[PDB]
Amino acid sequence: YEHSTVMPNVVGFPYKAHIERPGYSPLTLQMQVVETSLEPTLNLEYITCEYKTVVPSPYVKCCGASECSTKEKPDYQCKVYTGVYPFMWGGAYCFCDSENTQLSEAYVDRSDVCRHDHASAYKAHTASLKAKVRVMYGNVNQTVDVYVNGDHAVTIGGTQFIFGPLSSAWTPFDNKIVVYKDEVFNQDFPPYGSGQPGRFGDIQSRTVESNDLYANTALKLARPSPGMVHVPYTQTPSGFKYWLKEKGTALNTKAPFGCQIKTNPVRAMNCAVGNIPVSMNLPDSAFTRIVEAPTIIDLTCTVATCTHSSDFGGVLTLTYKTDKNGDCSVHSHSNVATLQEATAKVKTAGKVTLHFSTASASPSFVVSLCSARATCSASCEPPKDHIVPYAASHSNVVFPDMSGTALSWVQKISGGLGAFAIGAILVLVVVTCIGLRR
């Protein structure tokens, strides 16, 4: 037997799915979602870490001149300064008074801890969904890990289940994101090879192990002070530290729909949105034929107490006449109210009691026990509390039944005015007809 249904994608909400075919008693399947995961496909662009400046000892030539040649190093800066008189602790370093020359140079290379402290720039793409689903029916209780994409087909107790695809193509990640430690940010980054000093991405590398590097930190050298041996340089501070100081607000404290961001790998969990279609193929061993099922005749429904709240604040009793003790499948055919149990023990006593939850002042819904059906109308008072810690266990609906008190009053007023209008139009019709007969 093949069946299809749609279930809401909210974690912790029980779902009762009703199955009914000729020649067998109805059945109810309990389906629940324990956790959901939404992972995007990432392709790395570059990584960034802090820098370090390599500046070797200066080369002082006494009574001579020197010239330096360009090298191929990240931000290599060299200069030759003429007319210097270095000093040391003993005395003058060079005999010649003003024929000396100091050669200076420096460059920049990635830090020695770049492998342990770095930020990665990723480009997001289409995202896939994984879920963990608990299925209960009859004597079957199992949790399975499925891919919600319309491809994975799982087998629980000889029953085939296919999930997905999700009904909404929504992801919280923007096109370009940056990942650091345990945080993701929806911040655009400069393109590779075009970084700017002082800000994010001042030094760029294709990967952690790559042997090339792009650096732009505005290294400038200065002429040494007279009577001195040193190398003065000016350079904008590391852009990575500046970014770390005022990165902004993380997506963990801003992601909508209350879903939690985790890294390694990048993923978002419990992202409550949309609904999942479920296609199911059931074997005949899980059903029960009518012959070995109890027969229910003259069953009516009434409500004891109703206070609409997020809990199961509603009790309804069912009266019936049967022929043998047994178990039956009970279900509610409308989403205005949601039941809690799925199987009920029917006995010769002729009375059962069930719990339910609702969110309308006056709910009217049809319940079914085994093959028999009945209707239930109730009036529920609002609760007195204000804040509860648990989530709602009911589908949100507020529209009352047309037989409710407010609907009754509007119907009465409308009927009175309609009768008045009908009388007026009838009077006009008869008057104009007799006038035209003249």
Ligand X SMILES: *[C@@H]1O[C@H](CO)[C@@H](O[C@@H]2O[C@H](CO)[C@@H](O)[C@H](O)[C@H]2NC(C)=O)[C@H](O)[C@H]1NC(C)=O
Ligand Y SMILES: *[C@@H]1O[C@H](CO)[C@@H](O)[C@H](O)[C@H]1NC(C)=O
Which residues of the shown chain bind a copy of itself in the complex (CB under 8 A)? Answer: 41, 43, 45, 125-126, 128, 150-155, 160, 162, 191-194
Asked if residue 405 binds ligand Y (CB under 6 A), the reply is no
Work out what residue 297 binds among ligand X, another protein, ligand Y, none; the CB cut-off runs from 5 to 8 Å by kind.
Answer: none
What is the distance between the alpha carbons of residues 205 and 201, in angstroms, rounded to a whole number?
9
How many other C-beta atoms can be found within 10 angstroms of the C-beta atom of residue 314? Answer: 26
Work out what residue 136 binds among a copy of itself, ligand Y, another protein, none; the CB cut-off runs from 5 to 8 Å by kind.
Answer: ligand Y
What is the distance between the alpha carbons of residues 409 and 404, in angstroms, rounded to a whole number?
9
Backbone angles phi, psi at 276, to 5 degrees: -110, 125
Of 11 and 124, which has the nearer Cβ to a copy of itself? 124
Of 23 and 90, which has the nearer Cβ to ligand X? 90
* Residues in region 137-156 near ligand Y by CB under 6 A: 141
In the complex, least distance from residue 97 CB atom to ligand X, rounded to whole angstroms: 9
Query: Dihedral of CA 146/150/152/156: which sign?
Result: positive
SS3 286: helix
Work out what residue 384 binds among ligand X, ligand Y, another protein, none; the CB cut-off runs from 5 to 8 Å by kind.
Answer: another protein
Of 13 and 122, which has the nearer Cβ to a copy of itself? 122
Asked if residue 425 binds ligand X (CB under 6 A), the reply is no
Work out what residue 95 binds among ligand X, another protein, ligand Y, none; the CB cut-off runs from 5 to 8 Å by kind.
Answer: ligand X
In the complex, least distance from residue 199 CB atom to ligand X, rounded to whole angstroms: 49
Query: If we measure between CA atoms, which residue out of 192, 194, 212 comes closest to residue 109?
Result: 212
Contact indicator for 351, 49 with CB cutoff of 8 Å: no
In the complex, least distance from residue 371 CB atom to another protein, rounded to whole angstroms: 35
Half-sphere exposure of 74 (CA within 13 A, CB side): 19
Asked if residue 95 binds ligand X (CB under 6 A), the reply is yes
Work out what residue 409 binds among ligand Y, a copy of itself, another protein, none; the CB cut-off runs from 5 to 8 Å by kind.
Answer: another protein
Contact indicator for 77, 219 with CB cutoff of 8 Å: yes
Residues near another protein, by CB under 8 A: 253, 258, 308-310, 359, 361, 379, 381-392, 396, 398, 405-406, 409-410, 413, 417, 420-421, 424-425, 427-428, 431-432, 435, 438
Question: Could you tell me if residue 95 is left (phi over 0), alpha (psi between -120 and 50 degrees) or otherwise beta?
Answer: alpha
Contact indicator for 20, 329 with CB cutoff of 8 Å: no
Query: Dihedral of CA 260/263/265/266: which sign?
Result: positive
- C-alpha distance from residue 372 to each of 120, 292, 299, 330, 340 (Å): 62, 16, 7, 10, 19
Of 332 and 360, which has the nearer Cβ to another protein? 360
Asked if residue 65 binds ligand X (CB under 6 A), the reply is no
H helix or E strand, kind and range, residue 410: helix 405-437
Work out what residue 420 binds among ligand X, another protein, ligand Y, none; the CB cut-off runs from 5 to 8 Å by kind.
Answer: another protein
Token pair in block for residue 363? 């709910």
Work out what residue 63 binds among another protein, ligand X, a copy of itself, none; the CB cut-off runs from 5 to 8 Å by kind.
Answer: ligand X
Question: Where do contacts with ligand Y occur on this chain (CB under 6 A)?
Answer: 136, 141
Residues that bind ligand X (CB under 6 A): 63, 95, 99
